[PDB]
Amino acid sequence: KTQPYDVYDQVEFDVPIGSRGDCYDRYLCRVEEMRQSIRIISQCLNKMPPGEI
């Protein structure tokens, strides 16, 4: 969200942040990353301008 690399902020991102610094909540956010990652891949399929490689 802070530093764009190649066409960012235009794609909708969801970042999971917990509360406790234990191993379980540090695992839950990784699965929550995985469920909120297809949103980016679907938006990548939605926006594809044909041109140079």
Structural tokens at position 5: 């690399």
Q: Is there a binding annotation on residue 29? A: yes
3-state secondary structure of 49: coil
3-state secondary structure of 51: coil
Q: Residues 8, 13, 43, CA angle at the centre, nearest 5°?
A: 75
Residue 36 contacts other proteins per CB under 8 A:
yes
CB of 14 to other proteins, least distance (A): 7
Number of residues that bind other proteins (CB under 8 A): 11
Question: For residues 1-30, which are near other proteins according to CB under 8 A?
Answer: 14
Positions at the binding site for [4Fe-4S] cluster: 23, 29, 44
